Design a protein around this ligand. Structure first.
Ligand SMILES: C[C@@H](c1cccc2c(-c3ccc(CS(C)(=O)=O)c(F)c3)c(C(=O)O)[nH]c12)N1C(=O)CN(CCCN)C1=O
Ligand SMILES: [Zn+2]
Ligand SMILES: [Zn+2]
Length: 232
C-alpha cells in the first residue's frame, strides 16, 4: 500500500513495482538460493513510448511475471534490457526477455563471466565500459563502470532526468550488516570503486541498492563501511 516492499512481503514468483520518480520505477522480486529467500531490485526507465529494463527479476518465472506486471501497471513495451553483472539475480531471465522481443545487453566482461558460470547470456556487448571511470549513454540512462566491487564487472546506472543512482549490487541498503554475497567480490578495491561513484554522481537524490530499500547518498558511505569491516 505504498511502502517499499520487503523480502517477507513478496512470495517467490510475484513481482512488485515501485515508483521512484517520473518515468522511473524499481522492480522487486524474491528468490530462493541455498535454502534462504532474498529480495532483489531492478530498474525500469521510460524511453519515450518504450521502456528500458535494468536487470532481470532473478529467474525465468520471476522475469515472466515482471513483464506481466509492467504490462498491467505501465502498459508500454520493454524494448531493451541491460544486465549490470553476471550473477543470476541480473541475467537469470534473459532467455525469457529475448523470447518476448527484448534486446538484451551487457558488457563483454559480464557476457564472458555469465557464459563461464553457466548463467544466461545477454545478446549484445556494451563497449566503452572496460576501464574504471568509463561512462556511456544508453537511452535515458548513463552506464558507468566504477571498478571492481561486488564483482569485477559490476555497472552502475544513472537516470539524469531524475537524479536517480541505481547502484546495483555494488551498493547495499542502510540496514545491511555485511557485504552480502562476496563470492566474486574485490573487498580491497570496493571502497575505491564506491569513492569513484560518489565523485561521479554527487547530485544523486535517490540511491537504489541491488537488494533492499532505496535511500539517499548515505547508502554509498554505508556500503564502504560495511565492506571495510567485512574485509577486516
Ligand atoms: C545470486 C547471487 C546471490 C545469491 C544469494 C544471496 C545474494 C546476495 C545478498 C546476500 C545477503 C544480503 C544481505 S547483507 C547486505 O546484509 O549481507 C544481500 F543484500 C544480498 C547478493 C548480493 O550481495 O548482491 N547476491 C546474492 N550470487 C552471488 O552474488 C554470488 N553467487 C555464487 C555464484 C558464483 N558465481 C550467487 O549466487
Ligand atoms: Zn551479484
Ligand atoms: Zn546481488
Amino acid at each position: 500500500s505504498g511502502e517499499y516492499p520487503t523480502v517477507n512481503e513478496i512470495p517467490v514468483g510475484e513481482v512488485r513495482l515501485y515508483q521512484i520518480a517520473d518515468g522511473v520505477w524499481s522492480h522487486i522480486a524474491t528468490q530462493s538460493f541455498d535454502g534462504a529467500v532474498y529480495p532483489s531490485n531492478g530498474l525500469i526507465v521510460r524511453d519515450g513510448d518504450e521502456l528500458l529494463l535494468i536487470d532481470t527479476a532473478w529467474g525465468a518465472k520471476n522475469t515472466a511475471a515482471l513483464l506481466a506486471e509492467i504490462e498491467k501497471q505501465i502498459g508500454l513495451p520493454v524494448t531493451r534490457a541491460v544486465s549490470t553483472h553476471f550473477h543470476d539475480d541480473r541475467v537469470g531471465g534473459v532467455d525469457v526477455l529475448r523470447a518476448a522481443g527484448v534486446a538484451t545487453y551487457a558488457s563483454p566482461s559480464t557476457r564472458r563471466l555469465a557464459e563461464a558460470e553457466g548463467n544466461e547470456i545477454p545478446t549484445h556487448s556494451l563497449e566503452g565500459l572496460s576501464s574504471s571511470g568509463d561512462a556511456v549513454r544508453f537511452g535515458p540512462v548513463e552506464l558507468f563502470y566504477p571498478g571492481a566491487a561486488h564483482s569485477t564487472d559490476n555497472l552502475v546506472v544513472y537516470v539524469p532526468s531524475a537524479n536517480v543512482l541505481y547502484g546495483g549490487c555494488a551498493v547495499h541498503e542502510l540496514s545491511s550488516t555485511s557485504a552480502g554475497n562476496v563470492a566474486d567480490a574485490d573487498l580491497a578495491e570496493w571502497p575505491t570503486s564506491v569513492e569513484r561513484i560518489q565523485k561521479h554522481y554527487p547530485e544523486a537524490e535517490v540511491v537504489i541498492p541491488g537488494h533492499g530499500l532505496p535511500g539517499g547518498l548515505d547508502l554509498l558511505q554505508h556500503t564502504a563501511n560495511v565492506v571495510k569491516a567485512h574485509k577486516n
